[PDB]
Amino acid sequence: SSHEQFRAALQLVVDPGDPRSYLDNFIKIGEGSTGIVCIATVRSSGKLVAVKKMDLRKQQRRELLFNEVVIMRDYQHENVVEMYNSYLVGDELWVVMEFLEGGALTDIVTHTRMNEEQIAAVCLAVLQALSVLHAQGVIHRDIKSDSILLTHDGRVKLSDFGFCAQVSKEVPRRKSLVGTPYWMAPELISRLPYGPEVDIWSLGIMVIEMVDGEPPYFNEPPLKAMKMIRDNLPPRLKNLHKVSPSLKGFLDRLLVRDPAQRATAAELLKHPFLAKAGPPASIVPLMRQNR
């Protein structure tokens, strides 16, 4: 069976043993792509972690799990959710990771209005993560507000690498159709070989998400909106009156159809709009735990 082959392959990269021997008090906090995310306690230290458990028999692309456990293990960056361990518990792959108590960014963009200082803080954090990640040939391929987690004190970390991939000098592009439809880049939906630039476009969409509270064509069906992204010009902000010229100039360097002229993360780190970025304390009030 291909299933047992995949189990045995995971045993070569997964941490040995049973995690249920030092983790307890599972509190379900997330669902989705046939994988539940729980909060757990570490018996040794009492610290809290997040455990993503994915059933291997219910996956459209099992290989991506591979990616997530291989690319992200030993990865350390202040703006990236750190993975500590991974385990194979029966037919379930468990990923043990840092627990972000502040929740996701979607919860903020659907309930409140963010200012340009906070938007610039979020973007600076995401771009600092992305410059390193792309320098190592890692493409997140699912940049959206759901993939942004926060601490209680307002620190921003990138998360949900379940679609990520790696490119090299030998293999510099991907051709798979992954991501969430409304955030996908034009070259990606157009079945074109793409590189890290798709992460920039998606970041741009998230900026729209932080301005308008939703991505473009959110009302349309997924495939219809994907065709619209494929054919139409770069989408324009609905709440265009609320954004400063600096933010519009920043966003224009992100939502470029041609990936060759789309700005890179390293370039965007030099943009003046990110000077508006505030400290994590500026994100503290946006949190749901208050307001």
C-alpha to C-alpha distance for 272 and 277, rounded to whole angstroms:
10
Kindly report the backbone phi and psi dihedral angles of residue 67, in degrees, each rounded to the nearest multiple of 5, phi listed first.
Answer: -45, -55
Taken in order 179, 184, 186, 190, is the CA torsion positive or negative? positive
Q: Cβ neighbours of residue 232 under 8 Å, at least 6 residues apart?
A: none
| Residue 256: CB minimum distance to ligand G5X, A | 27
Q: Does 248 show up as a binding residue in the annotation?
A: no
C-alpha to C-alpha distance for 198 and 203, rounded to whole angstroms:
9
Catalytic residue flag (residue 142):
yes
Is residue 207 near ligand G5X by the rule CB under 6 A? no
| Residue 60: CB minimum distance to ligand G5X, A | 16
Indicate which residue of 55, 107, 142, 258 is catalytic. Answer: 142
Residue of 27, 41, 4, 131 whose CA lies nearest to 77: 131
C-alpha to C-alpha distance for 102 and 241, rounded to whole angstroms:
30
| Residue 183: CB minimum distance to ligand G5X, A | 16
DSSP class of residue 33 equals: S
| Residue 76: CB minimum distance to ligand G5X, A | 11
* Single residue of 10, 38, 50, 138 touching ligand G5X by CB under 6 A: 50
Do the beta carbons of residue 288 and residue 108 sit within 8 Å?
A: yes
Q: Does 99 show up as a binding residue in the annotation?
A: yes
Name the CA dihedral angle for 134, 80, 147, 58, rounded to a multiple of 10 degrees.
90
What is the Cβ-side half-sphere exposure of residue 44, based on CA atoms within 13 angstroms? Answer: 5
Q: Cβ neighbours of residue 68 under 8 Å, at least 6 residues apart?
A: 95, 161, 162, 164
x/- letters, 82..101, toward ligand G5X (CB under 6 A): -x-----------x-x-xx-
| Residue 115: CB minimum distance to ligand G5X, A | 23
Is residue 40 near ligand G5X by the rule CB under 6 A? no
Q: Does 160 show up as a binding residue in the annotation?
A: yes
x/- letters, 259..278, toward ligand G5X (CB under 6 A): --------------------
Nearer to ligand G5X, 50 or 208 (CB): 50
Identify each DSSP E strand in the chain by its residue range.
23-30, 35-42, 48-55, 83-89, 92-98, 103-104, 138-139, 148-150, 156-158, 165-166
* Single residue of 30, 181, 195, 280 touching ligand G5X by CB under 6 A: 30
* Overall residue count recorded for the chain in this entry: 291
Nearer to ligand G5X, 87 or 217 (CB): 87
* Single residue of 6, 87, 161, 201 touching ligand G5X by CB under 6 A: 161
Q: Does 35 show up as a binding residue in the annotation?
A: yes
Nearer to ligand G5X, 102 or 186 (CB): 102
Q: Does 74 show up as a binding residue in the annotation?
A: no
Is residue 52 near ligand G5X by the rule CB under 6 A? yes
Q: Does 71 show up as a binding residue in the annotation?
A: no
Residues that bind ligand G5X (CB under 6 A): 29-30, 32, 37, 50, 52, 68, 72, 81, 83, 95, 97, 99-100, 103, 149, 159-162
- Active site (catalytic) residues: 142
